Amino acid sequence: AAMKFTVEREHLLKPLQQVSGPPTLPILGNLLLQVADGTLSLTGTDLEMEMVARVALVQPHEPGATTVPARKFFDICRGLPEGAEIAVQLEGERMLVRSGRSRFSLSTLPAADFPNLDDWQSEVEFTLPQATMKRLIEATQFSMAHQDVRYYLNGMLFETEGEELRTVATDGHRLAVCSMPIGQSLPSHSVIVPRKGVIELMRMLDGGDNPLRVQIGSNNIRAHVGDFIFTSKLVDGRFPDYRRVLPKNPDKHLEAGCDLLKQAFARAAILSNEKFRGVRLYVSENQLKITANNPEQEEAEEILDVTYSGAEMEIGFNVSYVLDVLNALKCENVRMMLTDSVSSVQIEDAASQSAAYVVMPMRL
Amino acid sequence: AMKFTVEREHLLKPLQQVSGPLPTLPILGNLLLQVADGTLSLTGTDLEMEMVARVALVQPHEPGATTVPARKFFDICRGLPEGAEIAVQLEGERMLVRSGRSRFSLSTLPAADFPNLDDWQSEVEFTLPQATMKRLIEATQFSMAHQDVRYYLNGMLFETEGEELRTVATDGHRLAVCSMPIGQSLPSHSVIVPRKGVIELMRMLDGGDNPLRVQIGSNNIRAHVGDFIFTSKLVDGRFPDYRRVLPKNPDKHLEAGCDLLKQAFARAAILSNEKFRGVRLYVSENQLKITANNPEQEEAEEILDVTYSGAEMEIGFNVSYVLDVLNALKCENVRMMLTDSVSSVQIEDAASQSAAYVVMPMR
Amino acid sequence: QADLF
Amino acid sequence: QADLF
Ligand code: NA
Numbered sequence: 001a002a003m004k005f006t007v008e009r010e011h012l013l014k015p016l017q018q019v020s021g022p023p024t025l026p027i028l029g030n031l032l033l034q035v036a037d038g039t040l041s042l043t044g045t046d047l048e049m050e051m052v053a054r055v056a057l058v059q060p061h062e063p064g065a066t067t068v069p070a071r072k073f074f075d076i077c078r079g080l081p082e083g084a085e086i087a088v089q090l091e092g093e094r095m096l097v098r099s100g101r102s103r104f105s106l107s108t109l110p111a112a113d114f115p116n117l118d119d120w121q122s123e124v125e126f127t128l129p130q131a132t133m134k135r136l137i138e139a140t141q142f143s144m145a146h147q148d149v150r151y152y153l154n155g156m157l158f159e160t161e162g163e164e165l166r167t168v169a170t171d172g173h174r175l176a177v178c179s180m181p182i183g184q185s186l187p188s189h190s191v192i193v194p195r196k197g198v199i200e201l202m203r204m205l206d207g208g209d210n211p212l213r214v215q216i217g218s219n220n221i222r223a224h225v226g227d228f229i230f231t232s233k234l235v236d237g238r239f240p241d242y243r244r245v246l247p248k249n250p251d252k253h254l255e256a257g258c259d260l261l262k263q264a265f266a267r268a269a270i271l272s273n274e275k276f277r278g279v280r281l282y283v284s285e286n287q288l289k290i291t292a293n294n295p296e297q298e299e300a301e302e303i304l305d306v307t308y309s310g311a312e313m314e315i316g317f318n319v320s321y322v323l324d325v326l327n328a329l330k331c332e333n334v335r336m337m338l339t340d341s342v343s344s345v346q347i348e349d350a351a352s353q354s355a356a357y358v359v360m361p362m363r364l
Numbered sequence: 365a366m367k368f369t370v371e372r373e374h375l376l377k378p379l380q381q382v383s384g385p386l387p388t389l390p391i392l393g394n395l396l397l398q399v400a401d402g403t404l405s406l407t408g409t410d411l412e413m414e415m416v417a418r419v420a421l422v423q424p425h426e427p428g429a430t431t432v433p434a435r436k437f438f439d440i441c442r443g444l445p446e447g448a449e450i451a452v453q454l455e456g457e458r459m460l461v462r463s464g465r466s467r468f469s470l471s472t473l474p475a476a477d478f479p480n481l482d483d484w485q486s487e488v489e490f491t492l493p494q495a496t497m498k499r500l501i502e503a504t505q506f507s508m509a510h511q512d513v514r515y516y517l518n519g520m521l522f523e524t525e526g527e528e529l530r531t532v533a534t535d536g537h538r539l540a541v542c543s544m545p546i547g548q549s550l551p552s553h554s555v556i557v558p559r560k561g562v563i564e565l566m567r568m569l570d571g572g573d574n575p576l577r578v579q580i581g582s583n584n585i586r587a588h589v590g591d592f593i594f595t596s597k598l599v600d601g602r603f604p605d606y607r608r609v610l611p612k613n614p615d616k617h618l619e620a621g622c623d624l625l626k627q628a629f630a631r632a633a634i635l636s637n638e639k640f641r642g643v644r645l646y647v648s649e650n651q652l653k654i655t656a657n658n659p660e661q662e663e664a665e666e667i668l669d670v671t672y673s674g675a676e677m678e679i680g681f682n683v684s685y686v687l688d689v690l691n692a693l694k695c696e697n698v699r700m701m702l703t704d705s706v707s708s709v710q711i712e713d714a715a716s717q718s719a720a721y722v723v724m725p726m727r
Numbered sequence: 728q729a730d731l732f
Numbered sequence: 733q734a735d736l737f
Pocket of ligand 1: 703707
């Protein structure tokens, strides 16, 4: 009610942008603003997740709290000139924003009505560089399901075991797995982070040198990075046993230049069925032939020089799944591990086993 | 039948340009390909407009024509490596595209079924630089009516008078007019270019030094730029006269920095009504006060230093109409010409009368 | 909103 | 399209 603060525009922008990340209830469209002991806290929530930003206050201030429309407040702050001093105070049930000769009066909702996230205890904690969390997410995110009825597939598995953190994502047709050493002995734990949580967690990594502190409870996950705290509910489901689906002992190995392979699959794709995306691979001695056809009886054929010595074989794949893997890999050469035409194929960088991709074929 | 080999880079931009007008019938999704006397012609159409590109053939070729899916053929050519030689021939009802060890067989529709645009005679012709046509379109395009029942306002007026070419766009509330000298005496002529024609005409200007050749008939417009020919049907209606809405003898003049004015209207806009966008302007001696309020009793107030000596006045405007003008102008200072609160206002660059913007106020 | 014509 | 599981 007596909440007062003055802060430079540039010290508000990134915090305002981060908290607006997570309606039906009017208060969920607001940001909770709190002034307490030299800090301004900003909180945004969708009930499933919340983002809290802390801004140090070097200019005079008075304690208190309020809720203000998020988009309107951010747009005012963003719309002000570079270097503007933003003076904020309450006057009745209105929030007053003043800068230069610009005055704004915004509607408020009491701070006491802002939804608090349910208290929980962390069961596993670890610290990680931001780049490690970024690599784990980026290497696997494209493999998560898109609004699948097996709801546990729409998120990403976060699994700790020994000194390692691993991410796993699948849609039941293709899978991605990334394992990274974290240098801290961890209890064995597995949780599913929802799609929106993964996006928010990725969006919070500024690409700087501040480490990420992760706390995982039974039904919640918390990530602290610099002056930001992101909390998300976990997906209440059981992830499939992905260990079962990695080819254990493949008898066929193919190696090819990533760029040439990606370009050939990209051109073949043009003439694949628009909904089904099926392409045929014919593997023979040091050769890969890629074919595609559609209901219009149009046909594409690509012939490439590869490294391959095994038995001749034909295998069908959804070309979008193959292209997704080739675009996720950023290496000179790729290696493909195969058994037969009705079994999964493993794809990986020919010089790194950090990330593995498993694609189930299509019936030809 | 039709045969040609062409380097990828000689086909890319032509393929991109002809896919522009691009269906009700499957043939409209195709490009017409024709080989005749050292040239490959490529044509794309939506029945209202067409884009033709001509590509010189230096490698052996055989005459003929076919139609091929536009997006598929372009995507194949784009997808091939830089410097690829693209060999094309027909085999039955299929078009065969070969490059390196990449082979494509595309479905065809007969060239004889491709829709031809009706023959017409030009009544007015002129040449102008591409940058002049770009400036004329960009200065006025945002003011065109968005799917109005007065179909004639959905397009852009192209008017030749004396040695000048002018573009006019309006929605009945706000208007834009741009005039540019062309250095050729022209007959007085006015035509309405449809929205899609204006977009295609703008998309065809590569930003190079090749001049644009314009031909205007009674119901069609043609623009020639290098090896591209764009043709569009004209809107068959009568456009109103911009002269009638220009403020007659403005007694009030305001001058202000464009950026400061745009930023103040942008901030005020946040708290303006979401549907109505109403803002209030209070003009007084060397001062502009902008205010906005919405149904939830929220209020914004912006006070600015401007150049103004006239009588004090309050005037209401749709803030999106004002912001559209300020974003179209790319100048340091703007000038606003006014009479009263119930009459149009003229806005323009304080140092150029080439573009004028007329905005009707709100009660 | 006022009309131009 | 075949299933992993
Ligand atoms: Na009047």
